[PDB]
């Protein structure tokens, strides 16, 4: 089932756009972050801050990795930052599904709840934040949710032309049944001139069993910049 992983995919391009300042990447979510370097350097980039405490920067041996992610976890701790039962050595072993928790989280946190965007005059969920943000953009579309209100492609084109009118000016009349073709217009439209990258595919945002995760995470790249 290639859709499940949809999410794997987003969270990875996600962390790699954010890792690339540091000249870091991430080539398989499962083993690239076990070591516990990408995940500090990703936490650093993220919060501006670099780790308090001493790590072991050459983790050849087991303790090594598992004393680098317990720093990292410390350190979301010590940022409030609400974390899903996950231990060192889930991350370190390579649990798929803790990792993707994990990832999510620091979705959440630090491109959906903290930052501080324009449009907005509220104590509310993050979705909800979300949500209203989008609303706000686009009046004339019903956006409930991050799945079925984006299948067609159309809400993506009304968006894009909201934040600069001339980018999607015909979406109120693209075919709704040409949806890969109208999400592909729309998201490069977005990455050549809103500077907001293809974290979901336009095949992927449209796919029937995308997740309203991976659609979240892209979408919060709107309102940041």
């Given at each position: 089932?290639?859709?499940?992983?949809?999410?794997?995919?987003?969270?990875?391009?996600?962390?790699?756009?954010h890792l690339k300042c540091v000249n870091k990447?991430?080539?398989?979510?499962?083993?690239?972050?076990?070591?516990?370097?990408?995940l500090i350097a990703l936490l650093e980039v993220?919060?501006?801050?670099?780790?308090?405490?001493?790590?072991?920067?050459?983790?050849?041996?087991?303790?090594?990795?598992?004393?680098?992610?317990?720093?990292?976890?410390?350190?979301?701790?010590?940022?409030?930052?609400?974390?899903?039962?996950?231990?060192?050595?889930?991350?370190?072993?390579?649990?798929?599904?803790?990792?993707?928790?994990?990832?999510?989280?620091?979705?959440?946190?630090?491109?959906?709840?903290?930052?501080?965007?324009?449009?907005?005059?509220?104590?509310?969920?993050?979705?909800?934040?979300?949500?209203?943000?989008?609303?706000?953009?686009?009046?004339?579309?019903?956006?409930?949710?991050?799945?079925?209100?984006?299948?067609?492609?159309?809400?993506?084109?009304?968006?894009?032309?909201?934040?600069?009118?001339?980018?999607?000016?015909?979406?109120?009349?693209?075919?709704?049944?040409?949806?890969?073709?109208?999400?592909?217009?729309?998201?490069?439209?977005?990455?050549?001139?809103?500077?907001?990258?293809?974290?979901?595919?336009?095949?992927?945002?449209?796919?029937?069993?995308?997740?309203?995760?991976?659609?979240?995470?892209?979408?919060?790249?709107?309102?940041?910049?």
């Amino acid at each position: 089932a290639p859709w499940k992983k949809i999410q794997q995919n987003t969270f990875t391009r996600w962390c790699n756009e954010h890792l690339k300042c540091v000249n870091k990447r991430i080539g398989n979510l499962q083993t690239d972050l076990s070591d516990g370097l990408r995940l500090i350097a990703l936490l650093e980039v993220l919060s501006q801050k670099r780790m308090y405490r001493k790590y072991h920067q050459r983790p050849t041996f087991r303790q090594m990795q598992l004393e680098n992610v317990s720093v990292a976890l410390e350190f979301l701790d010590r940022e409030s930052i609400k974390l899903v039962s996950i231990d060192s050595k889930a991350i370190v072993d390579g649990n798929l599904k803790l990792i993707l928790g994990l990832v999510w989280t620091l979705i959440l946190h630090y491109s959906i709840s903290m930052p501080v965007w324009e449009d907005e005059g509220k104590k509310q969920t993050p979705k909800q934040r979300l949500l209203g943000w989008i609303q706000n953009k686009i009046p004339y579309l019903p956006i409930t949710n991050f799945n079925q209100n984006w299948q067609d492609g159309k809400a993506l084109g009304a968006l894009v032309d909201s934040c600069a009118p001339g980018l999607c000016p015909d979406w109120e009349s693209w075919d709704p049944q040409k949806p890969v073709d109208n999400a592909r217009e729309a998201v490069q439209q977005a990455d050549d001139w809103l500077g907001v990258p293809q974290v979901i595919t336009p095949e992927e945002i449209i796919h029937p069993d995308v997740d309203e995760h991976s659609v979240m995470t892209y979408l919060s790249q709107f309102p940041k910049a």
